[PDB]
């Protein structure tokens, strides 16, 4: 059943490559992607509580760690701008044929590994002491010991804030040239997110779409001989689906940057991202795309600082 990760990641890479969902150029606002993000977030907000109510799922919000979330998200934004894309853009653009993406994803994997259990694990160990003891109790909506949410703190059934924020986000989007329209893209992305949440919970990992854990699992399987899980097969599926969707659309091509220093630029970027995500407890997918619709406070804070670090590094380079 861990091989359902391959299929979920295949569909994920297809929708990512076709919709061109770049998170690094989404956190930089248009002087399409913003509305795509808000609509996907609202649809996931409704769908997660729906699937948890019908017993197909349980939301598992990530724990709160102010130092962790804040600083890791800032560094993750820095690295995402230095790498020319966050953890999703990089990973799926590997399959499009961009060698820059190859470094970026590879140094991202190495840095995440080193931060979790390697030369940078002292920093993660020091950060872990600021973990918030706040946790929710087991419910039809939440897994026992999960992080605090907007609904849990307000003492409300998750349906209430889910529906209110989601309806406000739909008003949001609909109130203000590709034929893969942003609404159908959001619908397909939310459906893929729900499918991933379900199949991953049945796989043993009670969570939705992620990136960091998949790369860590792949590197661990290659260098440790450990068995791969749902997330590593999901990463391989992301790459495979992005590649297939780019080749069918005639968009696949092995490419190089204009100047070789970009290779040095992205290689550092990914590294920062690897240190960022693991410190922040999540990437642009694990926190923003997956944890925000669960109304996780840690995910919202981590996304805030994703965008802040993005802005800082964007001014530094530009």
Query: Containing H/E element for 253?
Result: none
User: In this chain, which stretch among 45-53, 79-87, 127-135, 181-189 interacts with ligand OLC, using CB under 6 A?
Assistant: 127-135
What is the residue whose two structure tokens read 């872990």? 128
Please identify, using beta-carbon distances, which residue of 56 and 153 lies nearer to ligand OLC: 153
Pattern of binders to ligand OLC over 81-110, x per CB under 6 A?
-----------------------------x
Decide: 51 and 284 in contact? Cβ < 8 Å.
Answer: no
- The whole-angstrom separation of Cα 317 and Cα 298 is 28
Q: Using CA of residue 278, residue 267, residue 253, residue 221, what is the dihedral sign? A: negative
- The whole-angstrom separation of Cα 279 and Cα 269 is 15
- The whole-angstrom separation of Cα 144 and Cα 147 is 9
Question: Residue count at the site for ligand OLC (CB under 6 A)?
Answer: 17
Burial per residue of 265-298, b for 16 or more beta-carbon CB atoms within 10 angstroms, e otherwise = bbbbbbbbbbbbbbbbbbbbbbbbbbbbbbbbbb
Please identify, using beta-carbon distances, which residue of 63 and 243 lies nearer to ligand OLC: 63
By CB under 6 A, residue 78 contacts ligand OLC: no
By CB under 6 A, residue 56 contacts ligand OLC: no
Decide: 300 and 147 in contact? Cβ < 8 Å.
Answer: no
Taking CB under 6 A as the criterion, the residue among 66, 160, 167, 184 binding ligand OLC is 66
Taking CB under 6 A as the criterion, the residue among 130, 172, 252, 263 binding ligand OLC is 130
65 strand-pairing partners: 131
296 strand-pairing partners: 149
Taking CB under 6 A as the criterion, the residue among 8, 21, 280, 297 binding ligand OLC is 297
User: Closest separation between CB of residue 21 and ligand OLC, Å?
Assistant: 22
Please, which of residues 144-203 interact with ligand OLC by CB under 6 A? 150, 165
Closest CA to 228 of 254, 205, 256: 205
CB atoms within 10 A of CB 179: 6
User: Closest separation between CB of residue 310 and ligand OLC, Å?
Assistant: 11
Please identify, using beta-carbon distances, which residue of 9 and 147 lies nearer to ligand OLC: 147
By CB under 6 A, residue 308 contacts ligand OLC: yes
Please identify, using beta-carbon distances, which residue of 116 and 205 lies nearer to ligand OLC: 116
Taking CB under 6 A as the criterion, the residue among 67, 156, 187, 198 binding ligand OLC is 67
User: Closest separation between CB of residue 4 and ligand OLC, Å?
Assistant: 32
Taking CB under 6 A as the criterion, the residue among 15, 36, 71, 104 binding ligand OLC is 71
- The whole-angstrom separation of Cα 50 and Cα 129 is 35
Site of interaction with ligand OLC (CB under 6 A): 64, 66-67, 70-71, 110, 119, 130, 132, 134, 150, 165, 297, 300-301, 308, 312
């Amino acid at each position: 059943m861990i091989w359902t990760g391959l299929l979920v990641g295949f569909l994920f890479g297809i929708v990512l490559q076709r919709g061109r969902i770049c998170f690094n150029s989404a956190f930089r606002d248009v002087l399409y992607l913003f509305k795509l993000a808000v609509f996907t977030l609202a649809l996931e907000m409704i769908l997660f509580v729906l699937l948890s109510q019908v017993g197909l799922m349980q939301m598992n919000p990530k724990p709160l760690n102010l130092v962790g979330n804040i600083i890791g998200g800032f560094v993750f934004g820095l690295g995402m701008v230095l790498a020319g894309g966050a953890a999703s853009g990089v990973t799926y653009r590997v399959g499009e044929g961009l060698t820059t993406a190859w470094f970026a994803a590879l140094f991202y994997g190495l840095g995440a590994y080193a931060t979790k259990s390697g030369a940078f694990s002292w920093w993660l160990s020091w950060v872990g002491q600021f973990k918030s003891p706040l946790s929710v109790e087991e419910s039809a909506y939440y897994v026992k010991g999960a992080g605090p949410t907007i609904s849990s703190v307000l003492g409300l059934n998750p349906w209430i804030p889910a529906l209110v924020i989601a309806a406000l986000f739909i008003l949001w989007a609909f109130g203000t040239e590709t034929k893969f329209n942003w609404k159908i893209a959001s619908v397909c992305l939310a459906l893929v997110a729900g499918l991933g949440f379900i199949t991953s919970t049945l796989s043993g990992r009670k969570y939705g779409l992620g990136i960091t854990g998949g790369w860590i699992n792949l590197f661990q399987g290659f260098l440790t001989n450990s068995p791969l899980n749902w997330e590593g097969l999901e990463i391989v599926g992301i790459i495979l689906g992005a590649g297939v969707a780019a080749a069918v659309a005639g968009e696949f091509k092995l490419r190089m940057p204009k100047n070789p220093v970009t290779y040095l630029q992205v290689g550092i970027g990914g590294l920062l991202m690897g240190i960022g995500a693991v410190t922040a407890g999540g990437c642009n997918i694990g926190h923003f795309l997956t944890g925000v619709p669960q109304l996780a406070l840690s995910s919202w804070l981590a996304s805030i600082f994703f965008i802040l670090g993005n802005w800082t590094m964007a001014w530094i380079l530009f």
